[PDB]
């Protein structure tokens, strides 16, 4: 197989990150296939312009916490997919990353998410009781595709029905359509909503929100640049609307096929909050990438500057080398080491909102629907990429 000289032959697998083999059997089961086999902790693929793939769990944590040799200047695959139009501070490296994260953390820290807790759970309550009487529901189109969106719009703009039609912008950045066309499709997918957020940063540059608190924030005694200010507000809409609607689908479907696990939470309701990150360990969906900065040797192979390394976070929480029996959900597990929210300086700034949205879901779904099941003979349709999409969850009770 055509490949550079510094990569061996036993470390080569044909794997498209946007369409892996066995994706129809499960996004989690498809990516864990590289662990059940006998492959080193680091593997390489010729698809999408060629890039490395970290497979072992403890190696993914080591790459995230090493920004000196793994730069964030390129986070998407293929290599030249997210150029010119860059998101902030996802595509930044320290010490440049430090001041711009303080802007996103100004409104997304724990205290700011906690002051909205009674309002967030109000959405879950008003959304569940609209179908709790009918005994069934299309969970993807009556909650998971509504509850997280309505929460973030209440914090930001309230465009009603016109942003959910535009929420496909995030679908264009994590599942575009040859590396040349992937970049050109992501190019227009990035600028079409880069122009949509432009009339929002200027009309809100005075005062009085969650995006306004970020635009009016200063950096070293001066506001942010239009390219670096539009990229920050655009990143908040991306992860805030796409990386959470997909998590609720694959979790409630798992709980619908495990009548004992849901009974464990109904008996002890305090185990929900105390075991929230156990769901994040079992169900990770993000697969971020990094560009190697300097020539480094990790896992017995040398990585040359300019290459891309993929970090599928699904191979950290589901790694049997770190978590004993990674398939079973142990709410009482002591040390559930995961990388669902990433690691290092690029930690999920909205992990507390994710932890709060999932707790107010389970606490209000089980208080009204204790027993529930998935519709028999049905299942989701899994689509991979930078952020796993997945669709098709139907519940009965
Ligand atoms: C709900 C489940 C979510 C998951 C599983 C998730 C996952 C991730 C992951 C894996 C990263 C690391 C990216 C990288 O290393 O390049 C990340 C970064 C980030 N996420 Fe999320 N995300 C979620 C929701 C959110 C929400 C609701 C927000 C709200 C704005 C958000 C804001 C961010 C930001 C700002 C970063 C970049 C942090 C930095 O550059 O230092 N995320 N997320």
Author numbering: 9 to 185, 188 to 218, 221 to 409
List passages from the publication reporting this PDB structure.
Cytochrome P450 enzymes (CYPs) are heme-containing enzymes that catalyze hydroxylation with a variety of biological molecules. Here, we report the newly identified CYP101D5 from Sphingomonas echinoides. CYP101D5 catalyzes the hydroxylation of β-ionone and flavonoids, including naringenin and apigenin, and causes the dehydrogenation of α-ionone. A structural investigation and comparison with other CYP101 families indicated that spatial constraints at the substrate-recognition site originate from the B/C loop.
For further investigation, the three-dimensional structure of CYP101D5 was determined at a resolution of 3.2 Å using X-ray crystallography. The heme molecule was located in the central region between the two domains and residues Tyr72 from αB; His105, Arg109, Val112, and Leu116 from αC; Ala251 and The255 from αI; Val298 and Ala300 from the αK–β4 loop; Arg302 from β4; and Thr352, Phe353, His358, Ala361, and Gly362 from the αK’–αL loop, which are mainly involved in the interaction with the heme molecule by a combination of hydrophobic and hydrogen bonding and salt bridges. The active site of CYP101D5 was located at the bottom of the inside of the funnel-like cavity composed of five loops, including the F/G and B/C loops on top of the heme molecule. Given that the turn regions of the F/G and B/C loops showed open conformations in the absence of substrates or products, while closed conformations were presented upon a substrate or the product binding of CYPs, such as the CYP105 and CYP101 families, pathway 1 is most likely the substrate access channel for CYP101D5 and changes its conformation during enzymatic catalysis. The bent loop of the B/C loop mentioned earlier generates additional space for the substrate in CYP101D5. This conformation of the loop with the outward-pointing tyrosine increases the volume of the active site and enables the hydroxylation of larger substrates.
